[PDB]
Design a protein around this ligand. Structure first.
Ligand SMILES: [Lu+3]
Ligand SMILES: [Lu+3]
Ligand SMILES: [Lu+3]
Ligand SMILES: [Lu+3]
Ligand code: NA
Ligand code: NA
Ligand code: NA
Ligand code: NA
Lengths: 244, 244
DNA sequence: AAAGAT
DNA sequence: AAAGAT
DNA sequence: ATCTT
DNA sequence: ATCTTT
């Protein structure tokens, strides 16, 4: 399928290619820094041509948002199935050592998920799947050799700001957690877990509907979540009692 | 001076080189997107070797943050005078057409300006200068960006995600405005003006004392602000009333 | 402009 | 974690 | 768009 | 870090 080929292609591109700098038209190379502002951006750009190649092979069109305030990174659809669009967002986080627990911020809980046309490229009800492409890297300290420019003959000498990048493709609902990933920007938190649990989809929600209902009714502050629900056990109790 | 050499060197590097891609150790190149998320990252990496070069010509150590949500991007200081540090932060915005007005977000008003050690690499009182390197790019209307990869001999084929770019170096206070640059993330708004106003330093504040005190005592919302001040004239009136 | 999206 | 930093 | 104690 | 929308 689209999905299985996508993951295989991402997995393979990650294994074979190590991003190492920004190149100019004139050939001068600027090294990367070792923070997530840099790498998230690099990992998205890395993923774009792979996503397009595989979508194209399976007859899907690809659209990126036209404005910067819109989910998702990529909308995939067949002309024949305009109400089965697939949303793909690329998310990145890091570890300080391999096999530590990780978490992602999975986007707002107050935009498209509570209002079908808010901050989203197409109406939310035209997507039948929402996939996360998750990148995890081990952070590496900045050496002095990062502070210089390089030439193309030097490509393999450029120090890389990461070790052991790993990638996964999983449904948003499946890796979603029950605690906010950010406060003042109201983001859904993923599970906090090892990489494999993301791959295998060892999440907390039982269905995509539960995921949606949890995040559609999650209050913004502890203050408010104290008398309603703060986590999944509490939400199940709130549901049991009649949503009160 | 350090300042004058750095601005010359930034003007020159910007004239000479046009970043166009992410390159891998193995020689494959991934194209850039044309939004500010991509470009602000790229412009910061682009400025990094130049900053280090010029700082080294003047005897200044450069440090970047270890923590990822600490200001500033670059900390300069001679080791003999550690209490005379210089903060350099890189900011990016876009225009549609050349020589419309632009504005930047210039960082938090509720962090280190109100608490000497919060979200800052060194305590705020050890810095004697706060410089903004501003990048303004003209957005290139190909929002059907390029969705293939290139080899080192096709560098010339790689679409660039800007129509032009200009750069300035100015003190933060000088270009600071009186209106928040963002809401939930509580940023200082720059002036809303043409690029030459930023280069020429045509601001609104009478002094860096005025700028600091203004942003130190600015309230977070309209309702709160409406009893205090919403702009620089009301701030001056607030000053006349006894800071009340 | 102010507030809340990415 | 929550809340508020970049 | 993600990070921080 | 910055955008777009009230
Ligand atoms: Lu994205
Ligand atoms: Lu920066
Ligand atoms: Lu930075
Ligand atoms: Lu910055
Ligand atoms: Na790799
Ligand atoms: Na949000
Ligand atoms: Na250039
Ligand atoms: Na802030």
């Amino acid at each position: 399928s689209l999905r299985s080929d996508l993951i295989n292609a991402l997995y393979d591109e990650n294994q074979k290619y190590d991003v190492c700098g920004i190149i100019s038209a004139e050939g001068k190379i600027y090294p990367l820094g070792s923070d997530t502002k840099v790498l998230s951006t690099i990992f998205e750009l890395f993923s774009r041509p792979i996503i397009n190649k595989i979508a194209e092979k399976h007859g899907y069109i690809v659209e990126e948002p036209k404005q910067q305030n819109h989910y998702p990174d990529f909308t995939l659809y067949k002309p024949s199935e305009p109400n089965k669009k697939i949303a793909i967002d690329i998310k990145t986080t890091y570890t300080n050592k391999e096999n530590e627990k990780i978490k992602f911020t999975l986007g707002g809980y107050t935009s498209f998920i509570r209002n079908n046309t808010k901050n989203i490229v197409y109406p939310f009800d035209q997507y039948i799947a929402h996939w996360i492409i998750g990148y995890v890297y081990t952070r590496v300290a900045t050496r002095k050799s990062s502070l210089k420019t390089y030439n193309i003959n030097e490509l393999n000498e450029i120090p890389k700001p990461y070790k052991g990048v790993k990638v996964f493709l999983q449904d948003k609902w499946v890796i979603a957690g029950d605690l906010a990933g950010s406060g003042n920007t109201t983001n859904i938190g993923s599970i906090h877990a090892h990489y494999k649990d993301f791959v295998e989809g060892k999440g907390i929600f039982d269905s995509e509907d539960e995921f949606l209902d949890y995040w559609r009714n999650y209050e913004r502050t502890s203050q408010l979540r104290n008398d309603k629900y703060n986590n999944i056990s509490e939400y199940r109790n709130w549901i049991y009692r009649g949503r009160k």
